[PDB]
Design a protein around this nucleic acid. Sequence first.
DNA 1: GGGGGAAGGATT
DNA 2: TCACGAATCCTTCCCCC
Length: 342
Amino acid sequence: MIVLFVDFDYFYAQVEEVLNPSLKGKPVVVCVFSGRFEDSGAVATANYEARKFGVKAGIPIVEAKKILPNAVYLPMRKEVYQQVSSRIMNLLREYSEKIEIASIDEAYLDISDKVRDYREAYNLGLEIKNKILEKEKITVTVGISKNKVFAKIAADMAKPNGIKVIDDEEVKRLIRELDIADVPGIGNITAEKLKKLGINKLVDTLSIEFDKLKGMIGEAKAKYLISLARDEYNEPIRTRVRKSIGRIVTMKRNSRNLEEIKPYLFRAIEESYYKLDKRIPKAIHVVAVTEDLDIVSRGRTFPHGISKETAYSESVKLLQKILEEDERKIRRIGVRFSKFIE
DNA sequence: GGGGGAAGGATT
DNA sequence: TCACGAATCCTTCCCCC
Ligand SMILES: Cc1cn([C@H]2C[C@H](O)[C@@H](COP(=O)(O)OP(=O)(O)OP(=O)(O)O)O2)c(=O)[nH]c1=O
Ligand SMILES: *P(=O)(O)OC[C@@H]1CC[C@H](n2ccc(N)nc2=O)O1
Ligand SMILES: [Ca+2]
Ligand SMILES: [Ca+2]
Ligand SMILES: [Mg+2]
Ligand SMILES: [Mg+2]
Ligand SMILES: [Mg+2]
């Protein structure tokens, strides 16, 4: 297997540079509000000219402006970013039938049907970079290796506007030398957890008794890290099929009033059924988040598919059960659907 | 004890 | 941002043989 990973560079701000080329080479900051329009918002992303002086993703725009008051600040245009992304993903599909779209700016390709060496993989990567630049004026970073994990790590090491191969020998080296915290799927927790078990590299997981790891981080992760460390990881490039689909919305205030909560619950159902599309669930859960941010949840499985009308009627019954069996005030409410037909 | 299943916490 | 709330793992609890 040869896997190629593509990560679009500083994507939202780069799209703004493409739609207004006069911006290129000057600081550009894309602002995100998350529906909270009474303030200045936050930096969604900034181009490298802005990052150079400390304007980085996540900081409040009021703080960014104290650093670069004369940068160009643009509110997010999510629908445009999504459209440009979708067009680029379509360009990538021409290079492989085996593609996994991981996010709005990330895709994996299994290119094993077209190349079986890294020199030609690199050439294919160059062609992809040129094609996306030609057609959409977007620069990207390409990572190439023997599996998804090292392909992503390769792109992380090479961005922006990069291309990097991690060949078989470099994989072996990284298994010994790469900080296990930089492995995809390992957050701040887990990382600290296995640092307390003496594990700092992928190779270290081979000198623990397995159940000790497993006990700390769980069976799935343990198997994951060990298979990486043994250089046996080979997960296919494929469209991920969800096991559940849902939506949980925040109410304007705490409530324990059924009639007050219902419109929110119904909104969650409508949004969920849009997401479901042609998928038909046989199970429904109602999920309540209490004011202290705990979860209370109740599910039902049917021997048949759930119509939207049954989703409405059953969700109220489940919510009624939640209200009867727990005394806490509810702040967020929604539904999750699972057990899909076919 | 443990098969079976649901609640709901934990993690990315 | 795409990592606020979705999706997924998985421990704990509980029924009851
Ligand atoms: C997109 C995103 C990344 N991160 C983290 C992941 C990293 O630690 C770091 C950057 O990850 P990256 O993957 O490098 O960010 P990105 O490539 O998706 O974004 P951009 O194109 O704008 O440059 O920030 C978030 O916390 N939230 C997010 O929404
Ligand atoms: P991981 O490697 O740290 O993160 C992997 C993916 C990226 C997004 C998604 N994610 C991460 C963190 C949180 N809090 N929520 C998410 O959905 O995991
Ligand atoms: Ca968001
Ligand atoms: Ca419990
Ligand atoms: Mg990117
Ligand atoms: Mg990304
Ligand atoms: Mg990490």
